[PDB]
């Protein structure tokens, strides 16, 4: 009984060359919007983040994969939409810093406080602030954290770790870069160590490499972090079959899935964009990555499994799911990698909305941490940066441009970007808001004090 409707189909309704054929609506939307408005409490929240997934990135992927007049059945399906700002702060002056990194932005939605680029779960004065995940857990809710990146990376770590630098993955880097957080120095520990303490019910991702380090002090001194997790009662899975086999995940038997040494493999392969690549080279067609896997769970699969597991908690659950490599491939000026990760996120959003429609008390949110480099430009463009032409689903060429850095990595950009939601309290993402308003919306939605 989907009391609240999702947008079933907003693809062009007919022939795009004819009058009205490019319409995405079939009639007035007033009543459907009224029906999408509920202030009832949310039992559950599922927060879906496409890292670096700005409006440009969603547009490019739609054009490629679905066609210009196409529709992402997940991404584009959320009825309430708005734009949000994600500015960070300068540590020294406390003034705005126009372009955030993933650590400052994730800290923002996860704690409700602005911070400096590279900070995790701390403010500009380096004070710790409780995260939305720690709060939910303390309230009795089940908690899940899923990402295709290494688990120590910014987006997932922000929910469980409070360190002065996102670089402090394990004991060795923490000692050098976050001496104040170093276990041996009386601190709370490296990101990985804090993650082990946070003890969410379900944690699935990459980053097995760091689990090989040994703790420098404490109860588990001299053992590996992997050993520590086993000693601590975590159930460890490392492949798709092992994950599927899991029937329970909780405080007694928390699940920890480590599917790659670093980040999980990307869905699609293609060449890097190059200088005048749209003039000098032929059009590219993306191709599935063979290293992707049947033993490797996809984001949608990880999403479905977490939901099954966490759904067993009568009080409710909090789940964050990250499509991490949209950003990584945007930095890499690799259209196909970038777009393939966005189609990947869309499958995950579809799974989340099916559950939510069914359940009726679930708030689903789809947004990004910050904007990115990629731009859609005309085919005959002569640009200073890196470009590539692509053969889209329409049978037409689309060119993408990366022109904001002469360095090896293309840059994040500062533009406000799309926020979309479905479910109870969804109205709170409409209009202009701030990334910190999202923490407060989630908190109030679940009724946390």
Q: Directed axis angle between helix 437-446 and helix 132-139, to 10°?
A: 10
Q: How far is the CB of 327 from Zn ion (least distance, A)?
A: 4
Sheet holding 375-377, edge to edge: 274-275, 386-391, 397-402, 375-377
Choice between 233 and 431, CB closer to a copy of itself:
431
Does residue 383 contact residue 389 with C-beta atoms inside 8 Å? no
Name which of Zn ion, a copy of itself, none residue 369 binds, using a CB cut-off of 5 to 8 Å depending on partner kind: Zn ion
DSSP string for 170-226: SHHHHHHH-TTT-GGGTS---HHHHHHHH--SEEEEE--GGGGSBBSSSTTBTSBHH
Choice between 192 and 441, CB closer to a copy of itself:
441
Q: Is 263 among the residues that bind Zn ion (CB under 5 A)? A: no
Binding to a copy of itself (CB under 8 A): which residues in 90-129? 90, 93-99, 108, 111-114, 123-124, 129
Tell me which DSSP letter residue 282 carries.
P
Choice between 240 and 345, CB closer to Zn ion:
345
Q: Which stretch binds Zn ion (CB under 5 A): 47-55, 308-316, 342-350, 354-362?
A: 47-55
Q: Enumerate the H helices of 312-334 as residue ranges.
A: 325-331
- What residue numbers does the annotated binding site for Mg(2+) cover? 51, 153, 155, 322
Q: Which stretch binds Zn ion (CB under 5 A): 22-30, 48-56, 231-239, 426-434?
A: 48-56
Q: Is 408 among the residues that bind a copy of itself (CB under 8 A)? A: no
Q: Which stretch binds a copy of itself (CB under 8 A): 31-39, 167-175, 248-256, 308-316?
A: 31-39
Residue 284, beta-bridge partner list: 390
- What residue numbers does the annotated binding site cover? 51, 153, 155, 322, 327, 331, 369-370, 412
Size of the site for Zn ion (CB under 5 A): 7
- What residue numbers does the annotated binding site for Zn(2+) cover? 51, 327, 331, 369-370, 412
Size of the site for a copy of itself (CB under 8 A): 106
Q: How far is the CB of 49 from Zn ion (least distance, A)?
A: 7
What is the C-alpha to C-alpha distance for residues 425 and 102, in angstroms, rounded to an integer? 25
Contacts 24+ apart (CB under 8 A), 237-242: 238/208, 239/295, 239/296, 239/297, 240/293, 240/294, 240/295, 240/296, 240/297, 240/301, 241/295
User: Among all residues, whose Cβ is closest to Zn ion?
Assistant: 155
CA 31 and chain centroid, separation: 31
Binding to a copy of itself (CB under 8 A): which residues in 347-376? 371, 373, 375-376
Residue 390, beta-bridge partner list: 284, 398
Does residue 222 contact residue 215 with C-beta atoms inside 8 Å? yes
Options 174, 190, 367, 436; binder of a copy of itself; rule CB under 8 A: 436
Q: Which of 36, 56, 102, 311 is catalytic?
A: 102
* Active site annotation includes 102: yes
What is the C-alpha to C-alpha distance for residues 423 and 223, in angstroms, rounded to an integer? 45
Choice between 202 and 386, CB closer to a copy of itself:
386
Q: Which stretch binds a copy of itself (CB under 8 A): 192-200, 216-224, 266-274, 411-419?
A: 411-419
Binding to Zn ion (CB under 5 A): which residues in 83-122? 102
Q: Is 63 among the residues that bind a copy of itself (CB under 8 A)? A: yes
Options 186, 247, 406, 449; binder of a copy of itself; rule CB under 8 A: 406
Nearest Cα neighbor of 271 from 285, 260, 251 is 285
DSSP string for 14-60: S-TTSTTTT-S-SS--HHHHHHT---SPPSEEEEEEETT--HHHHHH
Q: Is 51 among the residues that bind Zn ion (CB under 5 A)? A: yes
Active site residues: 102
> What does the binding site for Zn ion look like in residue numbers (CB under 5 A)?
51-52, 102, 155, 324, 327, 369
């Amino acid at each position: 009984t989907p009391e609240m409707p999702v947008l079933e189909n907003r693809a062009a309704q007919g022939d795009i060359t004819a009058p009205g054929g490019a319409r995405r609506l079939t009639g007035d939307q007033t009543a459907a919007l009224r029906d999408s408005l509920s202030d009832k409490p949310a039992k559950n929240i599922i927060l879906l983040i496409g890292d670096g997934m700005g409006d440009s990135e969603i547009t490019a992927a739609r054009n490629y994969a679905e066609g210009a007049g196409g529709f992402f059945k997940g991404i584009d399906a959320l009825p309430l939409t708005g734009q949000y700002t994600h500015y960070a702060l300068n540590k020294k002056t406390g003034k705005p810093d126009y372009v955030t990194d993933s650590a400052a932005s994730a800290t923002a939605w996860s704690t409700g406080v602005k911070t400096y680029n590279g900070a995790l779960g701390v403010d500009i004065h380096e004070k710790d602030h409780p995260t939305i995940l720690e709060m939910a857990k303390a309230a009795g809710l089940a908690t899940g954290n899923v990402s295709t990146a290494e688990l120590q990376d910014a987006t997932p770590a922000a929910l469980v770790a409070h360190v002065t630098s996102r670089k402090c993955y394990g004991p060795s880097a923490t000692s050098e870069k976050c001496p104040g957080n170093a276990l041996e120095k009386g601190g709370k520990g490296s990101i990985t160590e804090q993650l082990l303490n946070a003890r969410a019910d379900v944690t699935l991702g990459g980053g097995a490499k760091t689990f090989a380090e040994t703790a420098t002090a404490g109860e588990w001194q001299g053992k590996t972090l992997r050993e520590q997790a086993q000693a601590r009662g975590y159930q460890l899975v490392s492949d798709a079959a092992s994950l599927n086999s899991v029937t329970e995940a909780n405080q007694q038997k928390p699940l920890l899935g480590l599917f790659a040494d670093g980040n999980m493999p990307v869905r699609w392969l293609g060449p890097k964009a190059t200088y005048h690549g749209n003039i000098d080279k032929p059009a590219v067609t993306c191709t599935p990555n063979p290293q992707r896997n049947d033993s490797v769970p996809t984001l949608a699969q990880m999403t479905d499994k977490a939901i099954e597991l966490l759904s067993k908690n009568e009080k409710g659950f909090f789940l964050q799911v990250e499509g991490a490599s949209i950003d990584k491939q945007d930095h890499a000026a690799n259209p196909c990698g970038q777009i393939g990760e966005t189609v990947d996120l869309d499958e995950a959003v579809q799974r989340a909305l099916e559950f939510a429609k069914k359940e009726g008390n679930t708030l689903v949110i789809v947004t990004a941490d910050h904007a990115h480099a990629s731009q859609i430009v005309a085919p005959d463009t002569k640009a200073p940066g890196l470009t590539q032409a692509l053969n889209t689903k329409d049978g037409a060429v689309m060119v993408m441009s990366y022109g904001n850095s002469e360095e090896d990595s293309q840059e994040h950009t500062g533009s406000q970007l799309r926020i979309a939601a479905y479910g109870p309290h969804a109205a709170n993402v409409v209009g202009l808001t701030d990334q910190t308003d999202l923490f407060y919306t989630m908190k109030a939605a679940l009724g946390l004090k």
